[PDB]
Amino acid sequence: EPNLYGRYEWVSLPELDRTLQAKMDTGAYTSSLSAKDIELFQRDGEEWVRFRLATKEADGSVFEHKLARSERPVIDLQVCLGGAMKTIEVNLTDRSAFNYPFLMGTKGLRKFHVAVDPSERFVADKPTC
Amino acid sequence: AEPNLYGRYEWVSLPELDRTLQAKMDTGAYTSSLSAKDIELFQRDGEEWVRFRLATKEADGSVFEHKLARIGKIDEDEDRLSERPVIDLQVCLGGAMKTIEVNLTDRSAFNYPFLMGTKGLRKFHVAVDPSERFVADKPTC
């Protein structure tokens, strides 16, 4: 029944136009995205956040997302895994010191119906959304 | 060739300690950990040992002693820095028994006193389905 994937998989973020490597982490609950220049602001009476990506090949592109319903901002992010696309909660924090700029926590794995085989890696190949 | 599809939490048993505990199956972590307190190294018969108590909710003041494997670590290992005692512990999961490296550290703040990291899961050839729980039944080894 579940999609048997590896310890690391490619993900695509259509709202960010980025393909990143993600660590499939059954120990974590929420997912996380490497971000810097994080600034909370308000628009039309709602709480938004803007940020840049904190990756080795990042650029100066700024993205804006409404906060979803720790102290890290949480957004609803579109994530393409394998041939599926789902919207999951992702918190923004600087992951420059880690090997993978994206971390897929347990809730995202459940939403994607994924089981993590720690012996495998990159089983889902490139994301097609 | 097929792995054992287990859940996010599983029963494990430790025969050298005679203890059955709940374990979080953690593909993010690399090393495994056992909730321990009053950790004290000592020497006996020229060998290096470590003495400790379990730091669990259902507490018990039993004192365990175990041969020491090493202290601290020896590219996939991103665990926090720790120079804490490590033991080669016999773990029984489902119906399988294997010896794995386990760090002694206080986990009394967490919900599960045992945490099996990626190395132990690979040793047991286990894949974690976070949607399921306690797929492997009581440890019968």
Side-chain angles (χ1 to χ4, degrees), chain A residues 1-55 57-65 67-68 70 72-129, chain B residues 1-56 59-74 76-141:
Chain A
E1 263 284 297
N3 303 120
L4 191 55
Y5 291 161
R7 200 190 181 192
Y8 325 111
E9 295 292 337
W10 290 100
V11 293
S12 292
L13 310 174
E15 295 151 314
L16 314 192
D17 199 7
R18 276 292 178 89
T19 302
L20 306 177
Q21 298 189 5
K23 180 174 185 171
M24 306 296 131
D25 190 340
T26 59
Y29 190 76
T30 321
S31 298
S32 189
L33 174 65
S34 191
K36 61 182 180 184
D37 299 335
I38 306 174
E39 170 176 283
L40 298 162
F41 66 101
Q42 298 195 30
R43 178 178 291 159
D44 295 326
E46 298 179 348
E47 312 182 28
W48 288 59
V49 58
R50 62 177 51 101
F51 63 92
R52 299 189 171 88
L53 284 187
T55 67
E57 64 280 351
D59 67 333
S61 280
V62 176
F63 314 95
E64 304 186 345
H65 289 266
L67 288 188
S70 298
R72 304 170 185 174
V74 182
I75 61 174
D76 288 320
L77 192 65
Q78 293 181 353
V79 177
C80 300
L81 181 51
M85 193 272 286
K86 288 287 194 170
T87 298
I88 64 176
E89 300 186 350
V90 179
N91 58 70
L92 310 171
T93 185
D94 195 324
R95 294 180 55 85
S96 301
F98 296 98
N99 296 338
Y100 297 93
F102 195 91
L103 187 96
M104 177 99 61
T106 286
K107 192 174 182 181
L109 293 167
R110 293 170 176 173
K111 190 93 168 192
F112 278 99
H113 197 7
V114 175
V116 188
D117 185 311
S119 306
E120 301 286 273
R121 66 179 61 196
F122 301 104
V123 181
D125 273 77
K126 301 296 288 197
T128 72
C129 301
Chain B
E2 295 273 21
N4 300 291
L5 188 147
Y6 290 167
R8 197 192 184 200
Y9 327 108
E10 296 289 344
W11 287 103
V12 300
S13 84
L14 318 176
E16 309 163 293
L17 314 185
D18 190 13
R19 291 289 186 270
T20 300
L21 302 175
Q22 303 189 15
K24 189 177 183 174
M25 315 300 268
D26 196 325
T27 59
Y30 183 82
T31 323
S32 300
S33 294
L34 171 64
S35 187
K37 68 181 180 180
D38 303 331
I39 307 174
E40 170 186 30
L41 308 165
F42 68 98
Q43 183 193 26
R44 190 163 68 211
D45 199 17
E47 303 273 21
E48 306 176 19
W49 291 66
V50 61
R51 166 161 49 247
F52 62 94
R53 296 178 174 85
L54 290 190
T56 62
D60 191 11
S62 298
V63 172
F64 307 89
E65 305 179 325
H66 203 283
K67 277 175 175 293
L68 181 71
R70 53 177 162 83
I71 292 172
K73 287 185 179 67
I74 296 179
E76 291 190 329
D77 191 348
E78 306 188 82
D79 298 308
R80 60 178 191 179
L81 297 183
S82 67
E83 304 290 347
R84 301 305 300 152
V86 181
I87 59 172
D88 295 327
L89 185 66
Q90 293 179 352
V91 175
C92 163
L93 171 62
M97 145 87 91
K98 281 187 171 61
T99 296
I100 60 173
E101 298 165 308
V102 181
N103 294 9
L104 301 182
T105 177
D106 196 326
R107 290 183 51 90
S108 58
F110 303 89
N111 297 335
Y112 299 93
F114 194 94
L115 192 126
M116 191 169 298
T118 294
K119 191 165 191 176
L121 299 168
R122 291 169 175 173
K123 189 68 169 173
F124 282 93
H125 196 9
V126 165
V128 187
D129 193 335
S131 303
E132 302 300 337
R133 53 163 57 199
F134 297 101
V135 180
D137 217 314
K138 277 293 186 179
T140 50
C141 295

